[PDB]
């Protein structure tokens, strides 16, 4: 309790994401890359038995961090401290551990595996947020409410129609995160110190084919589909820009959605879930973490821009901060957003009251236009006469509860007789919303359902705020 | 000369991109959108004559800003100012211009056309930058040189193998811009004030299928393949993040490439073209690429605080950021191509550097060889035995990855970039 | 109309700021630095007459840009193109033009003069914004209104008390901009190519004293108080961080103030000025330009970080973009903010109505606490009985207009008799606001008036939106 | 080892800054604020016994988080969770803990104390970094070397004259942090829920002068000189911009200095200390300085959208950004001092570089000399005649500017920075 701890790791993100970048995960993946490196070169006919491999396999999860810190505070080599620590627990394999590979073989490829597994943790949570909002969207598909532009009252829409506006942004984020996992991220493989594979060629007597095969077989055992061909020392750091840009994009989406909910809470039309007077505390927390996620990407674009030639180590420290925290911040935002979506309470009576109080004034443009075409040669008089009816109608609605007030007023004033027969539809809120209901139906069937169909066997998790 | 001018618009960027976001082109797109709207409504049955549509086509390219600036002064609303300016230039089509539409029908759709056309200007320049470095990489695929990690001498490589390392970045940049132009950017269409098409439903007496056809026909007349369907007032501003994110990625790529050239120039191994000396062009390229690198950070903030169906605090900043981002990327690609075309190498200076730094690199190979033979010969100091697969890596990469990526740009690779 | 133009230069910023960074201003300042350079070395007894100087003085404003572009598209030297153009118009002075100075002598020092003059354009506009808000703050010093936390109703404050919250931020910005003009920005002077003054020493036969005097006299004629001593080629670019950071800070202030006004417009308690139904278009425009100003600073901090040793030219292009646009964006924001402040309309009846509708529920915590100390041993019963009175009181206020409803209800219910004598004060809104009125008075007299006292002869300008 | 940990908190930053923002210290400050509040209210006449105040002092440093974590689970409000945790640890003082105060009385004031103390940790490290480079600059004030503009050889200078160029940046950084600690940061005090002190006015039966004295006494008991007077619920978050802006300025300064060292190391002129080789420490310093460089961009965004008297979307991000900014600056200053203490120079390597690059620098002086004598000698090639006032500039700068700036830190300059 005496040392500071980032609340992203201790409070806000899920346990699975926190462990995905843990030091134990890094070493177990380091030892898994050595097992794959061995069973790939042993596959290409080399002085590696099957006896050394299973001993590696049997001693993968266990790790002696004591000797690792002893070698790390002596020669100051994190990789070689673990190629020696692993050699102590694998006496038969020791000469054939990390055979021919450079340090970035275990460092870069393990980071790539962690980034991929990180996306596989986030993807179901994006789809869950989509699923929860989509259910609410068709629940309130016809719940008529006031639209707001400039934070001022505008023509009617429906609450479900507004939620689809939020879902659209999440669909773009799901698309981006799926392309990162399935296309953008490639394997680093075995490339040497400067990407020329000069050191692996010596181990294979200058046989280009076994060296190419070495990089091909390592890509399958790692679960990747291809690998970069012309790297320097590391995988092209531009990949880290693509990752954080997509994560920062999620932050922008979450910040807009939760700001909208905070705005709608001030109108008393919605209320976020709480524990069983109340403030939108969860949407506010989601905005703060989303803002932090939004701006974390500028560190990577500056880092990539100053990578010197074949490599420069000024990316090492910042990558172990920004990459895990971006994933931790994205994980915490989507956890909160799924909460808010699952428990968001809407108030139909408040929406109708706020709607009824503004409809007398929203309609004065459209009726005045129709009156002018019917012969209203005194446009200012006709407008002033309409504004008087609307102002008096808004008073009768509030104090007397007469909802159909403006209808009766204009029907009793035969100044507006040319449009008496058109008023029952002109004044119908179900007419003013346009195609709002049908737009929800097409959007859910044509775009939402295909996007999250592959996540059907993992949409059931209820996310809880603790 | 009295009023300050942005150097991006004044000199750095080419005039194609400069005019792509100009005001004249903007109202030409506004007028062309009103023509497509009239054609569509006439196609859907509305009483609009061919004489009115031919009248709009004829006076499309003639803009009288003196009238537009005048009516804008009283209106404070520039879209209607250009509506009634076109109505004056088209007395017959006057009652049907902008019929049933809202301001964002021309505001947002013209932006999407300018943004899509701006990408069409950038894309061949990315392809030329790729092709120019591709020629240098093959030309110097065997030019042995010193590789540097931590900016200190590392095991040898070839200059062409390093150039392909730059090209790999530009290849990822190319497909991002193509995905933007061919997939990410959708049309806004005719959605109304809050995206519910309530005004066009009224204009069509509630015919849902007419309003649907209106949006599909307009999307096709404008050259797009689809439109958003659950917008608020505007197209989702996340598209603006997507656009500026990819453009900022161009800057990061250009900055590293031109920084690598500045680094190698201090070793007298490479030299940028000119008419020792100053790498002025590579330095300007880094300067402009840095401004482009960070320009997207205001778009992510803008999107995050878009209130409900719309707030207008996106309008002024999009007028600045979006054109400047394209102008910055355009100027960087013009400089990068010119530098790539005239990239001078010095094999003798490269050779001497690898010679004076080789002692700090052979100590490992002689260690195991002395363990092999001698306990406790001239060609083991030969760097040609130490470059690995750098030669073959250039070949397969150029043949299997670079050539397919820019195959579609074969008809426009010849244009050389001249920096004066 | 065919070429793009930044709306900051053509629409949003003032003419005086646009011209402050114009190319004509740069050259006239270049020629002024040559006149000061000549009359400083002629002052130190050199082969420079008084005849060459006044010819320079007489031919300062005029500039032949034709020959300048002819020499610039031939040898590609912007400085030397103007040392030759000026030499053509000054035939007597030509050998003693730019005598001994490097290119950055005219480039850096002119930029410094432009940045200082830019701050002198902004400072009166910050003080004007302070003055306009301060007048409104004491106008509405006692105008009781609802405070808002989490965008939810909170205890009462006053509109003037809220405006002082805005003024406080502007006072910090005024302080920062005054320290930039009067302390942070130093003169670059004459330093040579790498700041060692090696080239000026040759012109003075190795006399350190005349070289030191040269830099001292040039600082006075330029209007600066001191100069940097150990520069490289240019003045330390960290100064550009300080400038843009303070300008970006103004953006944050303007964005918060105008977002608050947009929020208060949704409650119909305020309305920004318009032309003689309406949206807060000016506050929205001010937020967009403030957001652009907020983020423009990250380019400079990246630029300074990669300045290579004595100099690297990768700052030249970005400085002529970011520095003028930051000043232009700051100028446009303060122009808008002064407009909004001068014409901001408040609605006291709406504030009181929104206040009266929420006071029944704001007070239930404080009365319940007093009841418990008086013997209310059923806290939940007492709370539920209060919430029923408050809910019924809010209905009587809205429909019947009975403002003193909750008072009469609790006075007629002798369940709450122990606090009957304390209710007239407990329920007094003038009591609930605490020291809001007195805090406005002390803040205006003790902090606002001294801060803008030096701008008294320039607070009268009315800023107009065009 | 299973749960990920931030390397800033795990290794890079020293434990003084790490514990300065820890949770235990936070509630110790919360409890100390409640003690000062009780002392002040007793001083102003409220019925609070010395026995109750002595009870709070005695149990201040003993925190039982098991009780705090328990009551926080039901309350969801961590301030009251620690209120009634201290009430359990102080049965006598229980009815008067947090009396009349709101949550931000302890939340914001403890932050300001942690922020002010964090600056007090950073300031001597800035002074040591200044003093260490000051010693190298005087030691090498006459060490002639090659100056580089555009990273190409320029007219000669001395290594100490270049080191002072770095020091000039650190001097501006020093007075910024001092202005932050001594001027910019004010106390929040006892302002209430919306800053109007309405609750304390009620507690004091409306005595304006008592409430005024309450805020003045608390400001003095806490070690501050003044408090804000027209806040909303919190102190103005612009202070958080001011703080992170100055810390980001440290990163930009460290990044350029350590980049200059990396550049000079590729020329084998300088070398960072160790136990050719890798400038690992200068590279980590650049890496951490880059993260620190950009961390303020979320504070400027946070301030811009603070809604009216308060919105809570500042709380979570301030818990991350503010401590990490201090931790980043602390780690950078620890690395910069260690590099400055062991900065190795190589005068022979420096001399040879100026020799092999001198032809591209003397062409101008011989031009005017041949115009002088000869129409159309050995010591004109002597670089000691070409360094200008670089020697005297180091002297006056060190004597007249560096020594006064760090005079107040003379009692704490000896602590050496060891990087292992």
A185 in Cβ contact with A112 (< 8 Å): yes
Contacts of C244 in chain D (CB under 8 A): none
Q: Which residue in D has a C-alpha nearest to residue A259's C-alpha?
A: D313
The CA-CA-CA angle for residues C255, A157, A394, to 5°, reads 85
Q: Can you read off the two tokens belonging to residue A203? A: 């181990």
The CA-CA-CA angle for residues D221, D202, D72, to 5°, reads 70
Q: Which residue in D has a C-alpha nearest to residue B283's C-alpha?
A: D150
Please state, in angstroms and rounded to a whole number, the distance separating the CA atoms of residues B266 and B279: 10
Q: Can you read off the two tokens belonging to residue B402? A: 């670079």
Give me the helices (H) in B205-276, please.
Answer: 208-221, 238-266
C233 in Cβ contact with D152 (< 8 Å): no
Distance from CA of C69 to the nearest CA of D (A): 24
| B70: Cβ contacts below 8 Å, ≥ 6 apart | none
Please state, in angstroms and rounded to a whole number, the distance separating the CA atoms of residues C191 and C194: 7
Beta bridge partners of C147: C154
Specify the long-range contacts of residues C111-115, CB closer than 8 Å, at least 24 apart: C111/C319, C111/C323, C112/C185, C112/C187, C112/C188, C112/C224, C112/C235, C113/C29, C113/C222, C113/C223, C114/C20, C114/C21, C114/C25, C114/C26, C114/C29, C115/C185, C115/C243, C115/C323, C115/C327
Q: Can you read off the two tokens belonging to residue C199? A: 């080239």
Technique used by the depositors: X-ray
HEC letters along chain D: CCCCCCHHHHHHCCHHHHHHCCHHHHHHHHHHHHHHHHHHHHHCCCCCCHHHHHHHHHCCCCCCHHHHHHHHHHHCCHHHHHHHHHHHHCCCCHHHCCCCCCHHHHHHHHHHHHHHHHHHHHHHHHHHHHHHHHHHHHHCCCCEECCEECCEECCCEEHHHHHHHHHHHHHHHHHHHHHHHHHHCCECCCCCCCCCCHHHHHHCCCCHHHHHHHHHHHHHHCCCCCECCCCCCCCCCHHHHHHHHHHHHHHHHHHHHHHHHHHHHHCCCEECCCCCCCCHHHHHHHHHHHHHHHCCHHHHHHHHCCCCCECHHHHHHHHHHHHHHHHHHHHHHHHHHHHHHCCEECHHHHHHHHHHHCHHHHHHHHHHHHHHCCCCCCHHHCHHHCCCCHHHHHHHHHHHHHHHHCHHHHHHCCCCCCCC
Touching partners of B (3+ C-beta pairs < 8 Å): A, C, D
Is C120 strand, coil or helix?
A: helix
Cα torsion at D121, D125, D128, D130 (round to 10°)? -120
Binding residue per annotation — C75? no
Q: Which of A412, A404, A358 is nearest to A385 (CA)?
A: A412
Is A345 strand, coil or helix?
A: strand
B410 in Cβ contact with A222 (< 8 Å): no
Contact D303 C435 (CB under 8 A): no
Give me the half-sphere count of Cα atoms (radius 13 Å) on the Cβ side of residue B4.
Answer: 29
Q: Which of C424, C411, C363 is nearest to C390 (CA)?
A: C363
A196 in Cβ contact with B384 (< 8 Å): no
**How do B344-345 and B270-271 pair as beta strands?**
antiparallel
Q: Can you read off the two tokens belonging to residue A350? A: 């408040």
**How do D157-158 and D270-271 pair as beta strands?**
unpaired
D56 in Cβ contact with D86 (< 8 Å): yes
Beta bridge partners of A146: A156
Q: Can you read off the two tokens belonging to residue D177? A: 């942090």
HEC letters along D275-337: CCCCCHHHHHHHHHHHHHHHCCHHHHHHHHCCCCCECHHHHHHHHHHHHHHHHHHHHHHHHHH
Please state, in angstroms and rounded to a whole number, the distance separating the CA atoms of residues C131 and C342: 10
Contacts of D266 in chain B (CB under 8 A): 148, 151-152, 266
D20 in Cβ contact with D326 (< 8 Å): yes
Number of Cβ atoms within 10 Å of the Cβ of A7: 16
Give me the helices (H) in C180-271, please.
Answer: 198-203, 208-221, 238-266
> What values do phi and psi take at D195, rounded to 5?
90, 5
Q: Which of B304, B330, A163, A145 is nearest to D305 (CA)?
A: B304
C134 in Cβ contact with C448 (< 8 Å): yes
With left for phi above 0 and alpha for psi between -120 and 50, is residue A99 left, alpha or beta? Answer: beta
Please state, in angstroms and rounded to a whole number, the distance separating the CA atoms of residues A413 and A416: 6
Question: Pick from B1, B65, B290: which is nearest to C23 by CB?
Answer: B1
Please state, in angstroms and rounded to a whole number, the distance separating the CA atoms of residues D287 and D281: 10
Is A269 strand, coil or helix?
A: coil
The CA-CA-CA angle for residues C90, C95, C98, to 5°, reads 85
| A289: Cβ contacts below 8 Å, ≥ 6 apart | A8, A12, A251, A254, A329, A332, A333, A336, D316, D317
Beta bridge partners of D398: none
Q: Which residue in C has a C-alpha nearest to residue B26's C-alpha?
A: C2
| Residue tagged active-site, from D150, D183, D208, D407 | D150
Alpha carbon B206 to its chain centroid, in Å, reads: 42
Please state, in angstroms and rounded to a whole number, the distance separating the CA atoms of residues D361 and D343: 28
D188 in Cβ contact with D104 (< 8 Å): yes
Q: Can you read off the two tokens belonging to residue C150? A: 């989490």
In whole angstroms, how far apart are CA D8 and each of A299, C301, C350, D330? 15, 21, 52, 9
Please state, in angstroms and rounded to a whole number, the distance separating the CA atoms of residues C297 and C244: 5
Please state, in angstroms and rounded to a whole number, the distance separating the CA atoms of residues B203 and B214: 11
User: Count of A–B CB contacts within 8 Å?
Assistant: 250
Please state, in angstroms and rounded to a whole number, the distance separating the CA atoms of residues C160 and C138: 6
In whole angstroms, how far apart are CA B284 and each of B281, C77, C312, D147? 5, 15, 10, 21
Q: A154, A248, A260, A266: best mutation site toward chain C, by most C Cβ within 10 Å? A: A266
Q: Concatenate the DSSP letters of all residues of B136-178 into one string.
A: HHHHTTT-EE--EETTEE-S-EEHHHHHHHHHHHHHHHHHHHH
B301 in Cβ contact with B318 (< 8 Å): no
Q: Would you call A59 exposed, middle or buried from its count of C-beta atoms within 10 A (0-12, 13-18, 19+)?
A: middle
CA quadruple C261, C263, C267, C273: dihedral positive or negative?
positive
Please state, in angstroms and rounded to a whole number, the distance separating the CA atoms of residues C445 and D264: 57
With left for phi above 0 and alpha for psi between -120 and 50, is residue C317 left, alpha or beta? Answer: alpha
Q: Which of B321, B247, B266, B260 is nearest to B286 (CA)?
A: B260
Beta bridge partners of C152: C149
Q: Can you read off the two tokens belonging to residue D188? A: 């929040």
Contact B230 A298 (CB under 8 A): no
Binding residue per annotation — B152? no
Question: Pick from D280, D301, D360: which is nearest to B276 by CB?
Answer: D360
D108 in Cβ contact with D315 (< 8 Å): no
Question: Pick from A168, A194, A308: which is nearest to B157 by CB?
Answer: A194
Q: Would you call B367 exposed, middle or buried from its count of C-beta atoms within 10 A (0-12, 13-18, 19+)?
A: exposed
With left for phi above 0 and alpha for psi between -120 and 50, is residue D23 left, alpha or beta? Answer: alpha
- H or E element at residue C146: strand C144-149
The CA-CA-CA angle for residues A442, A444, A450, to 5°, reads 110
Q: Can you read off the two tokens belonging to residue C232? A: 């490289």
Distance from CA of D286 to the nearest CA of A (A): 6
- The radius of gyration computed from the CA coordinates of chain B, to the nearest angstrom, equals 28
Distance from CA of C253 to the nearest CA of B (A): 15
Contacts of D63 in chain A (CB under 8 A): 1
Question: Pick from A152, A280, A399: which is nearest to C279 by CB?
Answer: A152
Q: D186, D287, D309: best mutation site toward chain C, by most C Cβ within 10 Å? A: D309
Please state, in angstroms and rounded to a whole number, the distance separating the CA atoms of residues B193 and A234: 50
Q: Which residue in C has a C-alpha nearest to residue D306's C-alpha?
A: C256
Is C154 strand, coil or helix?
A: strand
Number of Cβ atoms within 10 Å of the Cβ of A408: 12
Please state, in angstroms and rounded to a whole number, the distance separating the CA atoms of residues B139 and C466: 59
Contact A192 B253 (CB under 8 A): no
Q: Which of C15, C84, C38 is nearest to C331 (CA)?
A: C15
Contact C266 A152 (CB under 8 A): yes
Enumerate domains of chain A plus CATH numbers: 6-99 (1.10.275.10), 100-373+419-457 (1.20.200.10), 374-418 (6.10.250.1570)
| Residue tagged active-site, from A82, A98, A140, A150 | A150
Give me the helices (H) in C2-50, please.
Answer: 7, 15-20, 23-41
Q: Can you read off the two tokens belonging to residue C393? A: 């009181």
Number of Cβ atoms within 10 Å of the Cβ of A184: 17
Alpha carbon D282 to its chain centroid, in Å, reads: 19
Number of Cβ atoms within 10 Å of the Cβ of C402: 16
Cα torsion at C164, C169, C173, C179 (round to 10°)? 80
> What values do phi and psi take at B8, rounded to 5?
-60, -45
- The radius of gyration computed from the CA coordinates of chain A, to the nearest angstrom, equals 31
Distance from CA of D101 to the nearest CA of C (A): 14
Which runs of E-coded beta strand occur in C229-385? 270-271, 345-346
Distance from CA of A301 to the nearest CA of B (A): 6
Binding residue per annotation — C379? no
Q: Would you call A351 exposed, middle or buried from its count of C-beta atoms within 10 A (0-12, 13-18, 19+)?
A: buried
Give me the half-sphere count of Cα atoms (radius 13 Å) on the Cβ side of residue D263.
Answer: 29
Angle of helix A238-266 versus helix A316-343 axis, rounded to 10: 30
> What values do phi and psi take at B271, rounded to 5?
-150, 130
Q: Which residue in C has a C-alpha nearest to residue D254's C-alpha?
A: C305
Q: Would you call A57 exposed, middle or buried from its count of C-beta atoms within 10 A (0-12, 13-18, 19+)?
A: middle
Alpha carbon A213 to its chain centroid, in Å, reads: 37
Binding residue per annotation — A387? no
Is C128 strand, coil or helix?
A: helix
Q: Which residue in D has a C-alpha nearest to residue B357's C-alpha?
A: D276
| D151: Cβ contacts below 8 Å, ≥ 6 apart | B262, B263, B265, B266, C308, C309, C312, D263
CA quadruple A74, A77, A78, A82: dihedral positive or negative?
negative
Is B94 strand, coil or helix?
A: helix
Binding residue per annotation — C277? yes
Give the residue carrying structure tokens 């095969």: A213
Contact B231 A306 (CB under 8 A): no
Cα torsion at A381, A386, A388, A392 (round to 10°)? 170
Beta bridge partners of B148: B153
CA quadruple D329, D332, D334, D337: dihedral positive or negative?
negative
Q: B63, B287, B310: best mutation site toward chain C, by most C Cβ within 10 Å? A: B287
In whole angstroms, how far apart are CA D97 and each of B258, D37, D87, D94? 63, 8, 7, 6
Q: Is C150 a catalytic residue?
A: yes
In whole angstroms, how far apart are CA C93 and each of B78, C71, C80, D123? 53, 19, 15, 52
Please state, in angstroms and rounded to a whole number, the distance separating the CA atoms of residues C98 and C93: 10
Give the residue carrying structure tokens 């004509």: C24
Distance from CA of D150 to the nearest CA of B (A): 6
A315 in Cβ contact with D280 (< 8 Å): no
- The radius of gyration computed from the CA coordinates of chain C, to the nearest angstrom, equals 31
Contact D312 A12 (CB under 8 A): no
Give the residue carrying structure tokens 């080239």: C199
Binding residue per annotation — D205? no
Cα torsion at C127, C128, C132, C133 (round to 10°)? -40
Is A350 strand, coil or helix?
A: helix
- The radius of gyration computed from the CA coordinates of chain D, to the nearest angstrom, equals 28
Binding residue per annotation — C455? no
Cα torsion at D365, D368, D371, D376 (round to 10°)? 50
A265 in Cβ contact with A280 (< 8 Å): yes
Binding residue per annotation — B315? yes
Q: Concatenate the DSSP letters of all residues of A415-462 into one string.
A: GGGGGTTTHHHHT-HHHHTTTHHHHHHHHIIIIIHHHSGGGGGG--PP
| D231: Cβ contacts below 8 Å, ≥ 6 apart | C165, C168, D188, D191, D195
The 8-class DSSP code of residue B345 comes to: E
Q: Concatenate the DSSP letters of all residues of C43-93 into one string.
A: TTS-S--SHHHHHHHHTSS---HHHHHHHHTTT--HHHHHHHHHHHH-TTT
Q: Would you call D363 exposed, middle or buried from its count of C-beta atoms within 10 A (0-12, 13-18, 19+)?
A: exposed
| C25: Cβ contacts below 8 Å, ≥ 6 apart | B2, C19, C114
Give me the half-sphere count of Cα atoms (radius 13 Å) on the Cβ side of residue C65.
Answer: 9
Beta bridge partners of A40: none
Q: D138, D283, D388, D405: best mutation site toward chain C, by most C Cβ within 10 Å? A: D388
Contacts of B278 in chain D (CB under 8 A): 149-150, 152
């Amino acid at each position: 309790f005496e040392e500071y701890r980032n609340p992203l790791t201790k409070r806000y993100a899920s346990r699975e994401m926190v462990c995905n970048f843990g030091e134990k995960r890094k070493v177990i993946l380091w030892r898994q890359l050595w097992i794959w490196l061995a069973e790939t070169q042993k596959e290409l006919g080399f002085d590696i038995t099957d006896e050394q491999i299973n001993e590696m396999k049997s001693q993968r999860d266990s790790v002696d961090f004591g000797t690792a810190a002893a070698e790390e505070k002596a020669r100051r080599h994190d990789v070689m401290a673990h190629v020696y620590t692993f050699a102590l627990a694998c006496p038969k394999a020791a000469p054939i551990i990390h055979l021919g590979a450079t340090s970035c073989f275990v460092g870069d490829n393990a980071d790539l595996i962690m980034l991929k597994d990180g996306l596989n943790i986030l993807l179901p949570k994006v789809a869950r947020c989509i699923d929860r909002l989509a259910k609410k969207a068709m629940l309130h598909k016809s719940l008529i409410c006031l639209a707001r532009t400039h934070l001022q009252p505008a023509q009617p829409t429906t609450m479900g129609r507004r939620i689809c506006m939020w879902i659209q942004d999440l669909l773009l984020d799901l698309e981006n995160l799926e392309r990162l996992k399935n296309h953008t991220i490639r394997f680093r493989g075995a490339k040497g110190a400067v990407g020329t594979q000069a050191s692996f060629m010596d181990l294979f007597q200058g046989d280009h084919q076994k060296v190419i095969k070495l990089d091909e077989i390592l890509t399958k055992k790692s679960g990747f589909q291809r690998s970069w061909c012309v790297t320097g020392q590391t995988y092209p750091r531009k990949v880290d820009i693509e990752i954080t840009n997509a994560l920062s994009n999620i932050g922008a989406t979450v910040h807009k959605i939760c700001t909208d909910i905070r705005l709608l809470s001030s109108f008393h039309e919605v209320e976020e879930p709480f524990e069983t007077k109340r403030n939108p505390i969860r949407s506010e927390r989601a905005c703060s973490l989303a803002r932090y996620l939004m701006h974390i990407s500028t560190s990577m674009v500056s880092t990539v821009s100053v990578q010197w030639l074949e490599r420069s180590l000024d990316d090492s420290a910042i990558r172990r901060i920004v990459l895990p925290e971006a994933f931790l911040a994205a994980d915490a935002c989507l956890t909160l957003l799924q909460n808010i979506a699952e428990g968001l309470i809407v108030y139909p009576m408040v929406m109708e009251a706020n709607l009824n109080s503004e409809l007398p004034f929203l309609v004065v443009e459209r009726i005045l236009v129709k009156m002018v075409s019917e012969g209203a040669a005194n446009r200012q008089e006709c407008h002033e006469r309409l504004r008087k009816h609307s102002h008096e109608a808004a008073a009768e609605i509030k104090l007397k509860g007469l909802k159909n007030s403006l209808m009766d007023k204009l029907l009793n004033d035969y100044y507006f007789a040319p449009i008496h027969s058109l008023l029952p539809t002109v004044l119908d809120p179900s007419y003013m919303i346009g195609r709002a209901v049908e737009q929800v139906e097409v959007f859910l069937n044509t775009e939402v359902d295909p996007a999250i169909h592959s996540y059907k066997d993992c949409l059931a998790l209820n996310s809880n705020i603790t």
